[PDB]
Design a protein around this ligand. Structure first.
Ligand SMILES: Nc1ncnc2c1ncn2[C@@H]1O[C@H](COP(=O)(O)OP(=O)(O)NP(=O)(O)O)[C@@H](O)[C@H]1O
Length: 280
């Protein structure tokens, strides 16, 4: 699939840099013809077939294909895609309230209500994605953006579909690997992966939202991964002494090693609490 090859600079003006990754950089931008603002994600292309630098065409096209199919309040949308010799430039919906990661860093820890307000939106977005058999595979605070953080109940959108895959055969087997602190045991063990992996990540995010602490984080990546595979975590009283037993129950049913025994996204929405790379 080829994309628009005219110079993006002839149609957009860029500004502040929103995020910087290993093979991608995101900058705020404005479309000249409408005055509307977006987030331009510049993904570096591979210069040869056998290169570690850059992202393969296959991987870029997968992210674009998935983004083109989604339209939901809690997920980022794709506006246009350009490309040149060195990059594929995705013009994405702008989320200017910053990362949930930075929001949590400035506030330390939330109340269960504040935590559930964020979680419910994440669950709604994931429910949409999983309904389309799309596994995100990289869910974490850094990949959740707020529309406006200067409001008591910030609205959010899930971003970064660089590892997202269509799961049409129930599972994918291709060494997909996200951030150690949030990956499920099956990722750590290089086993077939499915929508269940995202549910584990949601459990980790929930633990963090409520305590301000990471459940499996070790001093090294290998330690973290070892902790994940052994489901080595506990609810420290210093952090959870005033957290409800139901909230812990919700987390406990997500941080389950056997993917088949883990709550599904539908289960999470009906749960009593809710119901109204790897080397370094
Ligand atoms: N739509 C958006 N609106 C605002 N900020 C965004 C948006 N998309 C991404 N960002 C920011 O840019 C950062 C990096 O974007 P991301 O999509 O995660 O790239 P990446 O997948 O890490 N790229 P790469 O390093 O090439 O694998 C994020 O963590 C956000 O802070």
């Amino acid at each position: 699939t080829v994309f628009r090859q005219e110079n993006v600079d002839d149609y957009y003006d860029t500004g502040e840099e929103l995020g910087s990754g290993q093979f991608a950089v995101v900058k705020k931008c404005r479309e000249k013809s409408t005055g509307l603002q977006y987030a331009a994600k510049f993904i570096k292309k591979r210069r040869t077939k056998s290169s570690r630098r850059g992202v393969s065409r296959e991987d870029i096209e997968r992210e674009v294909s998935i983004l083109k199919e989604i339209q939901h309040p809690n997920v980022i949308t794709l506006h246009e895609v350009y490309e040149n010799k060195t990059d594929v430039i995705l013009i994405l919906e702008l989320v200017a309230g910053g990362e949930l990661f930075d929001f949590l860093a400035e506030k330390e820890s939330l109340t269960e209500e504040e935590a559930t307000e964020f979680l419910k939106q994440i669950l709604n977005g994931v429910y949409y994605l999983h309904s389309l058999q799309i596994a995100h595979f990289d869910l974490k605070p850094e990949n959740i953006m707020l529309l406006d953080r200067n409001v008591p109940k910030p609205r959010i959108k899930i971003i970064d579909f660089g590892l997202a895959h269509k799961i049409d055969f129930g599972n994918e087997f291709k060494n997909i690997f996200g951030t150690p602190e949030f990956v499920a045991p099956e990722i750590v063990n290089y086993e077939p992966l499915g929508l269940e992996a995202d549910m584990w990540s949601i459990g980790v995010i929930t633990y963090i939202l409520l305590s301000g602490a990471s459940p499996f984080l070790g001093d090294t990546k290998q330690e973290t991964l070892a902790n994940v595979s052994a489901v080595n975590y506990e609810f420290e009283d210093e952090y959870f002494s005033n957290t409800s037993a139901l909230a812990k129950d919700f987390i406990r049913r997500l941080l389950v090693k056997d993917p088949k025994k883990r709550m599904t996204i539908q289960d999470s929405l009906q749960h009593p609490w809710i119901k109204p790379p790897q080397f370094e």
